Amino acid sequence: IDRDTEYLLQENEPNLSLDQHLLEDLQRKKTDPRYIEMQRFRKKLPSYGMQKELVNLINNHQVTVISGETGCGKTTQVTQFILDNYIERGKGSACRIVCTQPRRISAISVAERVATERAESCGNGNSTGYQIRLQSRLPRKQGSILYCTTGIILQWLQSDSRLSSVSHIVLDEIHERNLQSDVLMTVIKDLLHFRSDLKVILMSATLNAEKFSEYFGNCPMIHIPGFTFPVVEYLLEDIIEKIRYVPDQKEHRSQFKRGFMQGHVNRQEKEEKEAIYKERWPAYIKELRTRYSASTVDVLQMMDDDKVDLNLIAALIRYIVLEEEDGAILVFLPGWDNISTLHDLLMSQVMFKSDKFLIIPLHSLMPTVNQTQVFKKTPPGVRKIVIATNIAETSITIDDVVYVIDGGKIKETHFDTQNNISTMSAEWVSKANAKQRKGRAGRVQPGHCYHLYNGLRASLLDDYQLPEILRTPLEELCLQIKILRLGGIAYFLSRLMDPPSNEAVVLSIKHLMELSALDKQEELTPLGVHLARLPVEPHIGKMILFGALFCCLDPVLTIAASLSFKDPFVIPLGKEKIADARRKELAKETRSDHLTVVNAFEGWEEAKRRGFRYEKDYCWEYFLSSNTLQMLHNMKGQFAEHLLGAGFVSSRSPKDPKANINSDNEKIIKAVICAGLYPKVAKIRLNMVKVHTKSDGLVSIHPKSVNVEQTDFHYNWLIYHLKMRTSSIYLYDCTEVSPYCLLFFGGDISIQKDKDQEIIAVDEWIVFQSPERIAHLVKGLRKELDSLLQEKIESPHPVDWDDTKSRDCAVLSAILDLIKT
Ligand SMILES: Nc1ncnc2c1ncn2[C@@H]1O[C@H](COP(=O)(O)OP(=O)(O)NP(=O)(O)O)[C@@H](O)[C@H]1O
Fold first, then answer.
1. Does ligand 1 lie within 6 Å of residue 203's CB atom?
2. Nearest to 480 by CA among 785, 107, 192, 186
3. Nearest CA to ligand 1 atom 1
4. Angle between helices 576-587 and 593-609 in degrees, nearest 10
5. Any idea which fold 16-224 has?
6. Whose CA is nearest to atom 16 of ligand 1?
7. N vs C: which end of the chain shows fewer Cβ within 10 Å?
8. Closest CA to 589 of 736, 739, 740
9. Residue 588, phi-psi category: left (phi > 0), alpha (psi -120 to 50), beta (remainder)
10. Nearest CA among 341, 375, 428 for reference residue 386
11. How many other CB atoms sit within 10 Å of the CB of residue 784?
């Protein structure tokens, strides 16, 4: 059933006796010192001045766009303006306001900020609360504001597709162009025709907010103006000159291989622009030598385009602290790895270890609230340094920021449709992002923004980042569209504000079919309904889903985490060869790059029990990035409580013993890997080591692979996750599997005979010898599992592996028996 439907399932029932209660409470608030102090902060915001022009536009029209500068008050104020208007007109009980957020933490932290501005507690029957998935602090039924995530709304449309209890819906941060926000807009636009009463407010940062107006039929639009002080900008040349930066010698040595050998993408029109860059480079350097010292130019020539130089940021921070006037510094970094690294770099220095600095890492997976004291002001003499990702570009505003360090990089998903490769990587900011970052420094006074890219690069940046719909694989979206009965997949996507390419759509639908999430009429299978309940890429979904079904949870979640993000191995330059020997050491006899990660991870936990010296000694002698290991560990946790939500495990812990009974069985883990990586399958050529593919002919093994020199495989088949082309095609990480694993989790099953041999074909190209009875057997077992999955839709509960006679243990045990041939 559904546990997060309670604010939605209450009926909107206005009550004049509550209309009076809310208005009397409104004037007792006016006497409360906590309340008046918060009101003095609110009147300073530009939104306050426009308070009633905004509410008149909202009240006269059904769809409204509100643009404004960042920090003007959109997220925290507009809901209050609506609610307080209805209160003041004695119509308070009629207000049920829903405000969608892009991230859980936003929903929570905003609800808590708003509740303290109303001088109330959050939830507990007061005016404001939040609902995220699995966790809520709900306000009262009527006259209330609810902060939720777009994910919640999408679940809500399963039980009430008209959202009839809700009076006003506010779509926040829509300029971020998240997938979910983009489809929600399209759903909402069609809803308007059936809900005369419903009011919709779209809230966007100023840039291109007209586009949303035009998608909605040229709805009214209103801009909240703000003032930003002028900001001095600096490119890399300027920073290098100002601080006379010199990279370290003894630090930089034994540099960490990447590009092809750690598996990067290098798409089509990045290379076209990068051909422009290397052609304009000599002329740019010669020019620079006229305006900058020789040493500045010598350093810049040597700068690495791939990584953010965290030592330069550390230097630059130190210069600002010592040479510039008071003011908080804000640092923009691509992701969590760099944030914690920079943090550790700073506080490895005795200067910053003082109480005259407040150094705050800030990111979306951060615990609790933003109550971390990001917002609190520093007394004179103490300097606040905030190290963040792009969520401080628009979602969050720190008022006292005066210096902004823009690392120049942002993490983007990307998807190449011609060779069918989906990557995530650090990419250059756009001009639009760079302009938003610069503005965070002009909020209270004249500021400074230091961009870590050179003049040549600045001129070649893209003007805007592309919406995720145009660069992200579409499989999760497509499951949402059918679970919501929105109709044809391709047809619906074509109606989006920015419709995806048709090849992206066809590739995603094919993938869901090969995964058995859709049948060949493009309709949900029992398995697909469960995959849609998981907020992960479906292939990762199927794998972690079966890791719970087959009771091998802990190693599966590890592999799933590494496929989702990346493996923990690093190769220092020149140390390639002995690093390969340690990798194949961890491989033991598995013939599996995936079980290597598992062995490396399991070794790491037992090593961290034995103390730092033995743990650091481990990551060193076996070449693991302990930073990477930690995030994988944390993704394991997330995957677990994903499973907890869908009802497949009874606990939030991945090492829970009841879900781990088969975790030491190599055959079974390999079956589960196969569940998620099919149809990427290769047939090994018998006695260079090369393998046949359905896609690409004869291909080779990537040299990082524990199977690259291997000639004693014990089965004929491999599965791989990542394939990449340079001069030819190479498989990155592969795992030898039995034909019986393919036969169960694979495509359509067919039988051939003639005179000589009994043959089973899977998807017609995968052909092995075995008796025809086994084919009828797997046909039967597949249908029994389908019904196990169907009947766990309506009341999901984890399989109990301690019950003998279950009819779920019976079928899965039979399936386990079959894949153990
Ligand atoms: N948790 C908080 N604690 C203190 N001040 C806050 C908090 N959240 C926001 N503010 C302040 O509230 C003001 C407006 O913030 P906010 O309402 O998010 O503006 P906005 O950028 O227009 N809305 P949005 O960009 O959509 O999130 C700024 O001065 C912020 O510093």
1. yes
2. 186
3. 113
4. 90
5. Rossmann fold (3.40.50)
6. 73
7. N
8. 736
9. left
10. 375
11. 16
